[PDB]
């Protein structure tokens, strides 16, 4: 408060004296800190409501220095993970990672606490397949050699390649080691299933899969697959139609999933096919009608 009053006083003088000064930097920065104190003080209702008001002001301003918008986001994030909303923590935290100072102002110790919470959040997500972006963000970038990031990476990697034998072996250990995974066993078991269904349909040229095909992909019985796929429609993971008579699930939408080096090759291959076709057509129609175009 002292410093807030100081800056109000100060500007009566400076703006004219200098012929140019801005004093709006301190004020906003200060307001983030209020909200932040309240969080530590266990006044969680109060801190959210200031923060929303802050949002209004920030966005009216059309040029802000990075430092401002990162401090706001630091607060906005801190509030989410205190409530133990996993999904929300992760969505809002991405904003903080984007504007993040590549500077080492953000101490190494801080980077580990948020990164661990996020990873755990993504396991307990159910459509949050973002996992590669972390590796390009400072947050996880520097620290990939901790003991904490040994077991945890193996869980990420077992999802990626979609192996259920591999996942199963890893999950027994970590359920016991870490008591957070222990109460969230049900979700973890669900994660792997969902990940494979969206990965499999994409990579094959066909965008329809038999319940027979899926049953092998997911390495689970066709009885369980019919129940799983219905839920995929409800979540909005995949959207489409269920025919039990043609034994198909027809997708008409593949929800954005982060593309990676390998996947670029698969796309290249499909477009090759397409380029050769246009050429065949064009040569054909030049010869034909040659006499009279005009």
């Amino acid at each position: 408060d002292d410093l807030k009053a100081q800056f109000q006083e100060l500007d009566s003088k400076k703006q004219r004296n200098n012929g140019s000064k801005d004093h709006g930097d301190g004020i906003l920065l200060i307001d983030s800190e209020i909200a932040r104190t309240y969080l530590l003080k266990n006044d969680l209702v109060k801190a959210r409501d200031l923060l929303d008001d802050l949002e209004k002001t920030l966005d009216k301003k059309d040029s802000i220095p990075l430092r401002i918008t990162n401090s706001f986001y630091s607060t906005n994030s801190q509030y989410f993970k205190f409530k133990n909303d996993f999904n929300s923590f992760y969505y809002t935290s991405l904003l903080y990672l984007s504007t993040l100072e590549p500077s080492t102002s953000i101490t190494l110790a801080e980077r580990q606490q948020l990164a661990y919470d996020l990873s755990i959040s993504a396991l307990l997500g159910d459509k949050i397949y973002n996992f590669g972006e972390l590796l390009h963000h400072p947050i996880m970038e520097t620290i990939v050699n901790d003991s904490n990031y040994d077991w945890l990476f193996q869980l990420l990697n077992a999802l990626t390649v979609g192996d259920f034998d591999k996942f199963d072996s890893l999950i027994k250990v970590q359920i016991s080691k870490i008591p957070i995974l222990a109460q969230h066993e049900s979700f973890l078991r669900q994660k792997i299933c969902l990940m494979t269904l969206i990965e499999t349909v994409f990579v094959k040229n066909i965008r329809m899969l038999s319940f027979e095909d899926i049953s092998k992909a997911t390495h689970l019985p066709k009885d369980n697959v019919e129940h799983l796929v219905m839920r995929a429609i409800s979540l909005g993971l995949l959207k489409g139609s269920i025919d039990q008579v043609n034994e198909l699930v027809t997708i008409s939408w593949v929800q954005p999933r982060i593309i990676s080096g390998d996947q670029i090759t698969k796309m290249k291959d499909r477009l090759v096919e397409w380029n050769d076709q246009v050429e065949k057509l064009g040569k054909k129609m030049e010869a034909r009608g040659q006499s009279i175009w005009v």
Binding site: M230, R231, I233, S234, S241, I242, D243, Q244, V245, N246
Partner: protein
């Protein structure tokens, strides 16, 4: 947990939902806890199953009648009656086949509508190429 279950289009089962909420909300008076309110607990049965119907119609173009009877947790006969009322009131429209082979949840769409629609998917693909081309320009400078 009662409202959000009913809000999500996630399938739930009646005789199990019932137990979850039996010693808590069945025992809140002037809602379900009164004598004639007990038959409003019972009336909830109908709600839970018509809701699961409403969702299942959209997702499944076709689902076998036998499968539906297990999901709904009721004999074939009761099931047959509730589909019929929901069509009358016109939220969905459906065709049911009496030997009990299939229940084909669909409102049929004509050839003219399906064909009119095909031209539009094509218009959007043509746009997709055009946008990418401006951004190719940009990217060569960027590196």
């Amino acid at each position: 947990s009662l409202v959000k279950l009913f809000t999500t289009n996630e399938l739930m089962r009646w005789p199990i939902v019932q137990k979850t909420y039996e010693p808590v909300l069945n025992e809140d008076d002037l809602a379900f806890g009164g004598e004639a309110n007990k038959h409003h607990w019972e009336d909830l049965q109908k709600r839970v199953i018509e809701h699961n119907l409403r969702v299942i119609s959209e997702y499944y173009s076709r689902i076998t009648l036998l499968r539906l009877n297990e999901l709904l947790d009721l004999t074939e006969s009761q099931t047959e009656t509730y589909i019929s009322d929901l069509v009358n009131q016109g939220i969905i429209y459906a065709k049911v086949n009496r030997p009990a082979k299939i229940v084909n949840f669909e409102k049929p769409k004509n050839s003219s509508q399906l064909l009119n629609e095909w031209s539009h998917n094509v218009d959007e693909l043509l746009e997709h190429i055009e946008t990418i081309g401006h951004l190719i320009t940009k990217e060569e400078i960027m590196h």
